Amino acid sequence: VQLVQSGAEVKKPGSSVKVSCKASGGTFSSYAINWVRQAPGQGPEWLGGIIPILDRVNYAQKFQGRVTITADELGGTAYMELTSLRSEDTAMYYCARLADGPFDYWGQGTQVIVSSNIVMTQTPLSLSVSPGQPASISCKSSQSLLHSDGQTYMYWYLQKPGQSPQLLISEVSSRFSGVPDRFSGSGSGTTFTLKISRVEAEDVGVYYCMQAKDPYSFGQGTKLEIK
Amino acid sequence: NIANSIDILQEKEGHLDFVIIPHYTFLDYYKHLSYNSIYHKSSTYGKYIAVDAFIKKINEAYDKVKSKCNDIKNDLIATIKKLEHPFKKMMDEYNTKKKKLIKCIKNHENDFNKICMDMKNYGTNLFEQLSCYNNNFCNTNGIRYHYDEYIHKLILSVKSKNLNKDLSDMTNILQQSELLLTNLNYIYIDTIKFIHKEMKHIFNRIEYHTKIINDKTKIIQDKIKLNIWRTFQKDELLKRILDMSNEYSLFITSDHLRQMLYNTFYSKEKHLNNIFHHLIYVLQ
């Protein structure tokens, strides 16, 4: 499936914005759609999510009262309404089917310009390497990502320039399909590491760690650039 | 007794197929059981290539046993074609050729049972290999992947149709044939009587399968909501995988048969309308 969002907006402070998310196939079957925003100087921020088949919504505590997430009953369209807009709300807003086994996909993003329990600490903030040089990125969580089910809900995303974030590694070390063997994940509990044995030009972008132990929170980001 | 649970399909003129309903349900059950068991963990998800290839191999083996009844099946088609294109000898001929097809199916029952048991042993082995890291917190991700992939679109398809209105349209067609037959006071009357009798039996099987579809569509919709985005104890997860596999198999069997019978009904209705045309316009 592919997710298609509504167009760019410029809003005044105090107004509302409603963003749509359409599934190409016409349904969200039995899975979840989550809303994630990204402000100019910050890492991704989870707003909330919906499981349309259950009519179950989950909101981030800092957005409760201001965010309303809804879904079309038989139309395959999800919505996110953010009210009482402030200049802090200027961000790229995305809908996504987040890190669900072999399924991870995102909308193209909706530019909105206004005219957490588990904290993720990413290190370093930026990395400058020549092609072929190895690269390492660390992530530390304020609480353990190990769940009673035996899974450690640690994820690594790469956002290439002019693109939506893409899943690289699931549950600490599983490479996503199409991800080259140069990427590898390791760690347990609260400390995790992403390694690139040799950097290539196509690796350029911002890497983000995402935790799903208490869905969802992200690291601030590691900008990787060449030379 | 599989002799009382066989549906006969004639989707196009000159064609005949049969479905031993308990075997269709049984093979479908172990297909859903196989996928639920492998989709449960990411380390076993990749076994879908081997499951698809095993199921394909089981279907070809089942069709190879069905092909043993082909001469008898083709002999019955020739009698139906003679009885529909214009009598006691022919009606006797039809009854004993249909009995011969059921006998042929019955004669190869262990051959079908051997193939059904291969599918059961395969589905059961994967089901027994299902494991949880903590048997108190078993994830239900496999139930969701299998439902999204094989079931969800059939539920949507069913909900987009008015199967009850289809039944109503079919009763209207049957009533019009009864009206035409009643006021006809010949060999054409005997073929109109035979075709109307086939259509009424086909309709009764459509109504039977439609009741199962309407029932299982509501049950699948309610049960999926209780078995997803949750964890279960291992024994509870296993019981709910068998429960869903059962619900899906009963739904898919009836859905597939109702569509095949719907096609059979309108193929015979098209032929009956041509007989009505030749009798009214080209004859009297």
- Contact across the interface for A30 and B228, Cβ inside 8 Å: yes
Interface check for A132 against chain B (CB to CB < 8 A): the answer is no
Alpha helices for B16-69 (secondary structure H): 21-39, 42-45, 48-66
Which residues in chain A are closer than 8 Å to B231, comparing Cβ atoms?
149
Contact of B120 with B30, CB cutoff 8 Å: yes
CA-derived radius of gyration, chain A: 17
Which residues in chain B are closer than 8 Å to A1, comparing Cβ atoms?
none
- Contact across the interface for A30 and B152, Cβ inside 8 Å: yes
For A51, the closest chain B residue by CA position comes to B229
Backbone angles phi, psi at A11, to 5 degrees: -125, 155
Which residues in chain A are closer than 8 Å to B156, comparing Cβ atoms?
26-27
> What are the residue ranges spanned by the domains of chain A?
3-114, 120-219
- Taking only residues 41 to 60 of chain A, the set having a beta carbon closer than 8 angstroms to any beta carbon of chain B reads 51, 53-54, 56
Which residues in chain B are closer than 8 Å to A30, comparing Cβ atoms?
144, 147-148, 152, 224, 228
Token pair belonging to A135: 């690269």
* Side-chain-side CA neighbours of residue B49 (13 Å): 1
Partner-chain residue, chosen from A26, A31, A102, that has the shortest CB–CB distance to B144:
A31
* Side-chain-side CA neighbours of residue B280 (13 Å): 11
Write the DSSP symbol of residue A143.
S
Question: What fold is seen in the domain A120-219?
Answer: Immunoglobulin-like (2.60.40)
Interface check for A148 against chain B (CB to CB < 8 A): the answer is yes
Token pair belonging to A98: 């987040």
Looking only at the bridges linking them, the beta strands covering A135-141 and A120-123 are antiparallel
Token pair belonging to A48: 């909330």
Contact of A90 with A40, CB cutoff 8 Å: yes
Token pair belonging to A180: 């080259």
Least Cα separation, residue A148 to chain B (angstroms): 7
Interface check for B222 against chain A (CB to CB < 8 A): the answer is no
For B146, the closest chain A residue by CA position comes to A30
Which residues in chain A are closer than 8 Å to B228, comparing Cβ atoms?
30, 53-54
Which residues in chain A are closer than 8 Å to B229, comparing Cβ atoms?
32, 51, 54, 56
Residue A162 buriedness (CB in 10 A; 0-12 / 13-18 / 19+): exposed
Contact of B3 with B22, CB cutoff 8 Å: no
What is the interface size between A and B, counted as CB pairs within 8 Å?
Answer: 51
Alpha helices for B46-186 (secondary structure H): 48-66, 70-84, 88-107, 109-128, 141-146, 152-159, 163-182
Interface check for A176 against chain B (CB to CB < 8 A): the answer is no
Partner-chain residue, chosen from B45, B134, B137, that has the shortest CB–CB distance to A101:
B45
For A207, the 3-state DSSP assignment is strand
For residues B176 and B181, give the distance between their C-alpha atoms in angstroms, rounded to a whole number.
9
| Backbone angle region of A48, left / alpha / beta, with phi > 0 → left and psi within -120 to 50 → alpha | left
Which residues in chain B are closer than 8 Å to A148, comparing Cβ atoms?
134, 136-137
Would the CATH topology of A3-114 be identical to that of A120-219?
Answer: yes
A36: part of which helix (H) or strand (E)? strand A33-38
CB neighbours of B182 closer than 8 A, spacing ≥ 6? none
> What are the residue ranges spanned by the domains of chain B?
8-280
For residues B264 and A212, give the distance between their C-alpha atoms in angstroms, rounded to a whole number.
52
Residue type, B266: Y
For residues A32 and A30, give the distance between their C-alpha atoms in angstroms, rounded to a whole number.
7
Backbone angles phi, psi at B116, to 5 degrees: -65, -40
Alpha-carbon distances of A114 from A11, A34, A64, A68, rounded to whole Å: 5, 22, 19, 18
For A144, the 3-state DSSP assignment is coil
Least Cα separation, residue A196 to chain B (angstroms): 23
CA torsion through residues B60, B65, B69, B71, sign? positive
Domain A3-114 in CATH 2.60.120.260? The answer is: no
- Contact across the interface for B137 and A148, Cβ inside 8 Å: yes
Least Cα separation, residue A100 to chain B (angstroms): 8
Backbone angles phi, psi at A54, to 5 degrees: -100, -15
Write the DSSP symbol of residue A53.
T
**Other CB atoms within 10 Å distance of the CB of residue B112:** 20
Beta strands in B144-251 (DSSP E): 231-232
